[PDB]
């Protein structure tokens, strides 16, 4: 018999253990916490990994609801350069890379998100995700 | 680019007394003329901070005899760090040795590591005609690691515009950039 | 910018006599008196007061505001009137009005006897609210600050006498 919610978190893809903060407010839920790894890692066994956010809400008779989003621009590029970790010291240190199209095919994956309906605007932010970790873009 | 400044002639007046009234002693000269002149401090400060010894300060002499001069040297009061007295070279037409600013166009590869671009010369020396005063002159610093040296012998050179100083002259380096990680030794 | 150069209303009906050095400011709630710099010029007009300064020298320019607001303050106080209410947080803590005087029961082996002065009115509505009110503005602000400092707030516990709606920030005990 605990009140309703409006929860704001930021949980990863795959690593779904009851370990916090899937708890400190998600117990104010009686949260069906294993419903994540199933409903979420089913549609999102198509991306792979990465922090896909989640807005869960509890109600009167102790149950939840959510519709998650998409994995980082720091993930979809890490697989497309053979990279687990970035580069330790970006801007000068390049490990792997991505082409003008390999950056375009990524905006393709995260377009139902941001704000711009452009492929010219979206991939810039993706191209902005480039230097951010040190991965070079081939001219 | 080129400027204008309002020189007044001066005679036996006591330098220190001009100075007292915010005025700054000087004297303009060349092959032909050499005449005792003074100019206002603040006027000249503004003009000079802007003009330096690269461009052409034109002189509004007190008789419509306007003259095209270059600042050959400013003499500073060593102590309280103010200028004391200028020289004004009057330009003719035979080519004149003087100083043209340098444009280090680009960011080096040395920084883009941590380095420091040490600009040895912020200007160079060249005999050129007063027609062609290339008020900037650029350099390819962009391709520069640390331990990298640039010499005057590179350097584009406009029309045209002869290097006064011997080509082996060094003008640029990128240098190691301190480190607390050093030091402790 | 600027404050002495600012119209003082005289909402009917409120007198504003001028004698040497001091003004007077009369009204329904009462009557006053305000010390003024003899080198400050007072102006009663068509039912609107305003005052003027000889110069722009640091003294006058500052003497302006103070003489303005201090006269203005009197007005707005014989007019409506001034007051602060208070807030006895804390458990055991209580206060009942006794006679014309204010009794506090606040943590000490003796409850404590506050008898008001001329012009101060003590109103204890409920157990945990004290209302001090009157025409002398400063006197109020003052007196209300006696009451509070008969047990100022803690830093570890919402507990003690507080101003009418003044914040609480605390630091942790252990």
């Amino acid at each position: 018999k605990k009140v309703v919610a409006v929860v704001k978190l930021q949980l990863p893809a795959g690593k779904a253990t009851p370990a916090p903060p899937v708890g400190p407010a998600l117990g104010q839920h009686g949260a069906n916490i294993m419903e994540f790894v199933k409903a979420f890692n089913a549609a999102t066994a198509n991306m792979g990994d990465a922090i896909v956010p989640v807005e869960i809400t509890i109600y009167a008779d102790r149950s939840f609801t959510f519709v998650t989003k998409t994995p980082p621009a720091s993930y979809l590029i890490r697989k497309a350069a053979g990279l687990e970790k970035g580069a330790h010291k970006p801007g000068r240190e390049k490990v792997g890379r991505i082409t003008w199209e390999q950056v375009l095919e990524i905006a393709k994956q995260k377009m139902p998100d941001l704000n711009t309906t452009d492929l010219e605007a979206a991939a810039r932010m993706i191209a902005g995700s480039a230097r951010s970790m040190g991965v070079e873009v081939v001219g | 680019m080129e400027y204008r400044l309002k020189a007044y002639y001066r005679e036996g007046e006591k330098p220190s007394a001009l100075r007292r009234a915010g005025k700054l002693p000087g004297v303009m000269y060349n092959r032909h003329l050499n005449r005792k002149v003074y100019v206002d401090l603040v006027e000249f400060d503004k003009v000079f901070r802007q003009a330096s010894i690269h461009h052409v300060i034109v002189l509004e002499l007190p008789d419509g005899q306007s003259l095209p001069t270059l600042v050959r040297q400013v003499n500073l009061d060593k102590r309280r760090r103010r200028p004391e007295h200028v020289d004004f070279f009057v330009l003719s037409d035979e080519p004149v040795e003087m100083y043209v600013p340098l444009r280090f166009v680009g960011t080096p590869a040395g920084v883009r590591a941590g380095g420091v671009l040490q600009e040895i010369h912020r200007d160079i020396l060249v005999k050129v005609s007063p027609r062609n005063i290339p008020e900037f002159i650029e350099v390819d610093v962009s391709g520069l690691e640390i331990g990298d040296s640039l010499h005057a012998s590179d350097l584009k050179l406009p029309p045209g515009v002869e290097l006064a100083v011997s080509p082996e002259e060094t003008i640029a380096a990128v240098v190691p950039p301190e480190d607390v990680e050093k030091l402790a030794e | 910018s600027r404050i002495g150069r600012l119209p003082i209303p005289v909402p009917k009906g409120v007198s504003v006599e001028v004698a040497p050095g001091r003004v007077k400011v009369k009204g329904p709630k009462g009557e006053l008196e305000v010390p003024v710099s003899p080198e400050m010029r007072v102006v009663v007009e068509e039912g609107v007061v305003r005052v003027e300064r000889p110069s722009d020298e640091r003294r006058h320019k500052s003497l302006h505001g103070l003489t303005r607001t201090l006269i203005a303050n009197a007005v707005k106080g014989v007019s409506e009137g001034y007051s602060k209410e208070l807030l006895i947080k804390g458990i055991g803590y209580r206060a009942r009005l006794v006679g014309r005087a204010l009794e506090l029961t606040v943590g000490f082996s003796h409850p404590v006897v506050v008898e008001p002065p001329e012009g101060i009115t003590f109103e204890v509505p409920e157990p945990t609210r004290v209302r001090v009110s009157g025409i002398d503005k400063q006197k109020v602000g003052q007196v209300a600050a006696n009451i509070r400092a008969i047990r100022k707030p803690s830093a570890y516990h919402e507990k003690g006498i507080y101003y009418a709606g003044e914040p609480v920030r605390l630091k942790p005990g252990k």
Binding site: - | F48, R49, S52, I53, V71, Q73, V74, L76, K78, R79, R80, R81, P83, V111, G114, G115, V116, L117, Q118, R122, D123, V175, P177, E178, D179, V180, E181, L183 | -
Partner: protein, 141 residues
């Protein structure tokens, strides 16, 4: 800490601290100088104290140009010994600094950064100081 790698004469006469600088009254390497306002003897360890505080402050980055060098031996007598009996023995080095002397010069550093480095450095020092930025006068020199 700085001191002549070798010399000719072990000790030397004190002299006198008169005039303004004979040279180096203008910023001539970096973009920002610290300049000297009183005259005094600045001691090998002060220069160092001042250098360090700037390096520690820049932490990685910048260059530091130090334009006084300490080559004047500074002599002292042993404690509790009496007058005469000879000249003291060398105890360190100062450099002689006279108003308008550009002592340090930083480069490749943001104006905000420099003036907080050159400011601290000046606290290390025994004299009064003024921070300045390579004018244009200094290029005309």
């Amino acid at each position: 800490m700085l001191m002549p790698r070798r010399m000719k004469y072990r000790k030397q006469q004190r002299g006198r601290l008169k005039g303004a600088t004979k040279g180096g009254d203008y910023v001539a390497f970096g973009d920002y100088g610290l300049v000297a306002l009183e005259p005094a003897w600045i001691t090998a360890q002060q220069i160092e104290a001042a250098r360090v505080a700037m390096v520690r402050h820049f932490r990685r980055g910048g260059k530091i140009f130090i334009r006084i060098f300490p080559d004047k031996p500074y002599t002292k007598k042993p404690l509790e010994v009496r007058m005469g009996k000879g000249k003291g023995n060398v105890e360190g080095y100062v450099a002689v600094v006279k108003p308008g002397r550009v002592m340090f010069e930083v480069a490749g550093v943001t104006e905000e950064q420099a003036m907080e480095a050159l400011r601290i450095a000046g606290h290390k020092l025994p004299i009064k100081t003024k921070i300045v930025r390579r004018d244009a006068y200094d290029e005309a020199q």
